[model samples]
Target: SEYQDGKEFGIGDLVWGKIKGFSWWPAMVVSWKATSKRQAMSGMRWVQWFGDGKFSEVSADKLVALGLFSQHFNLATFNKLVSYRKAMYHALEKARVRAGKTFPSSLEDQLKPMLEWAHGGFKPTGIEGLKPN
Candidate 1:
């Protein structure tokens, strides 16, 4: 039998990466690529960054575990296509909020065409833990 493996993040795992333009931006692990030697805690990690949501690969030193966040929206609830649509809807709102605002679903009309294509636009589910942070 093979020996037990060490621990590292998996695909679909939420994470953070350092990019000079921002401070520890929120991201997700896309692929832990061939450049990674996870045991030594070094090499490249491919990730999807949520701010402007660009995909880029960064070094191990640049990566950090995102830990637990309350899963208030849970986009996993939808089917694949629906999940994508919902993700985009939230992404649009996230963009606005990053620069920052709160019209709450007001942007939906512009995206209504795409949302049939932009439907999860700022549906503030709940945020008991969100306020303090």
Candidate 2:
């Protein structure tokens, strides 16, 4: 009955964790076989969050898998990706400011494709960065 049934959540797999009220941010899967799920995270798979030092449980339905090859770049997925980027940027800024640091050039470079895609009306014209295998 779930759209995300059988979605991969292997240990160390990168994903987008969807938090209620808060936006999606980068997260990685943590091994769940050796621990009590309800005792610690109180749900299904446990995720190690990137936005904050905190890690917790989030269901498969709430977690979006990250894959450049398997990814679909329609308006809906694009919007979700944009939301994740914004949340990730804020989280990065929060950490960077604590150490008196600035945004990294590499980070901006990673974002160029998304920004360009939005700017060019989401056409294939702006998807130059997504070329080749």
Candidate 3:
């Protein structure tokens, strides 16, 4: 297990990587991809970039660690974010039901802008834990 050797990186760790416009974007490690014989893909990682709710798979070498999961991650904060998202989904569905319209079911798409705003918008407050330093 190349990814399990030391305290180098792990799920939920905050890392920075260069993105468009040469800006260093903060991302959260969500999962890992182990190389397999059938797929023959180099081991990559899934990171939920803060700028967007979309996840990107990048090589280990490309990421610079900013904060370790053990040191900075707050389970309470994470729970609050997920709870808020679910609550919003419920509200949206209720509204859609009342209007007789189909609500989009892609949670990622629905939470994209909201996640960005919670991280660092004019009224940022709900998800400050997600904002990396």
Candidate 4:
């Protein structure tokens, strides 16, 4: 089953690439097709993960699912998505609170983690500890 129809990439996508000449260094993709040997040597390249005017690229195989496509991927985009989900969670939690109800099943998974993070007990799941710098 190929998700060809669902795949996405864009000019400003933020992706992870390997930094050249630095052992085990992480780099952002500068462009889908970087125009320098240095970029190619780093195994493709991208730009800043969460800022404007950044680029990055990743292999077709290692793409993350949350991104749905490149236009929606990147650290900045992820932050946006997380924020969206967090807002939903908060809304639902507020409704629950008003109703004198406990945490809703719809929110427990999504909101709890964010709340934990805000309170300083959240352990980032996947990739959060995988050397993002």
Clashes of each: 3, 0, 0, 14
lDDT of 3 by residue, 1-133 (tens): 4345343446766566544453345566665442222221255566666634566667666776532222333335445565434533443332233334332336758744443332332132322233323
Give the TM-score comparing model 1 with the true structure, all chains together: 0.38
lDDT of each: 0.45, 0.49, 0.46, 0.33
| Number of the top lDDT candidate | 2
Off by over 4 Å in 3: 1-7, 32-40, 67-133
What's the lDDT for residue 107 in model 3? 78
Question: Across residues 1-133, which tens digit of lDDT does each residue of candidate 1 receive?
Answer: 1111333555654555677764455566665443243322235556776545567767656775543222222335333344344444554444334323345344436445433321333234321111211
For residue 102, model 1's alpha carbon misses the true position, in angstroms, by 20
Worst lDDT run of 10 residues, candidate 4, spans: 64-73
Q: Which lDDT value does model 4 have at 55?
A: 40
Alpha carbon lDDT of residue 17, candidate 4? 35
Per-residue error for 22 in candidate 2, Å, reads 1.3
Error of 1 at 21 (Å): 3.6
Ranking by lDDT: 2, 3, 1, 4
Give lDDT: candidate 2, residue 96. Answer: 33
